[PDB]
Design a protein around this nucleic acid. Structure first.
Length: 163
RNA sequence: AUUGAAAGUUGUAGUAUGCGGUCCUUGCGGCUGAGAGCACUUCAGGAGUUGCCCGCG
């Protein structure tokens, strides 16, 4: 069993990533899988290796980008583009991140950077953070590119939202 | 003196204004508590009895 571990950041963001795990898995197969919750970790047990996981994830994000291009720096009225991205700059930021994740992904190459998580995928985050007696410039909270993209896929494929 | 320390989810706001439970209406007309009827029939205030007794204008 893969029993792939899931990073502990936020039981809302952690839910999104560990729960888009399954949608990335189903498109590549990975039968007889289960999701054990640990309060916030949300570990997953599966008999899958990494390559089928990656093929499923890239298939999901390929459908995602195909849906994105259907409407239009391209801004589409999609859940992951403008339906849930409350910020105007994220309307363009998210699709570019998704396509960069793809371009890194079909060539069998792991990611090498990190990206800022909007408040949409986790309301616990934000712009600032109180360190001792004040805040930091910019956004202290950042997440891995693959986790960010896969949490976006999980949010777009499962969780309902109304505008 | 606890990642706690400072902090109104705050101030102002009428469901309010005019709107008939209203106009017409017999508890109405006819009706014998009436006809027959002995307080009637028998009946003694009744039976006894010295104004009594004496008398010179």
């Amino acid at each position: 069993f893969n029993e792939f571990k899931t990073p502990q950041i936020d039981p809302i963001f952690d839910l999104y990533v560990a729960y888009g795990y399954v949608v990335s898995l189903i498109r590549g197969g990975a039968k007889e899988a289960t999701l054990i919750p640990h309060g916030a970790s949300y570990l997953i047990q599966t008999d899958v290796s990494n390559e089928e996981f990656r093929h499923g994830l890239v298939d999901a994000l390929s459908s995602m980008l195909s849906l994105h291009i259907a409407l239009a720096k391209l801004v589409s009225d999609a859940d992951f583009s403008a339906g849930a991205n409350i910020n105007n700059v994220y309307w363009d930021s998210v699709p570019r991140n998704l396509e960069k994740l793809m371009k890194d992904l079909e060539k069998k190459r792991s990611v090498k950077g990190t990206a800022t998580i909007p408040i949409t995928l986790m309301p616990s985050a934000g712009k600032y953070m109180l360190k001792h007696f004040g805040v930091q410039g910019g956004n202290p909270i950042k997440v891995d590119l693959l986790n960010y993209a896969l949490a976006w896929v999980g949010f777009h494929y499962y969780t309902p939202y109304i505008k």
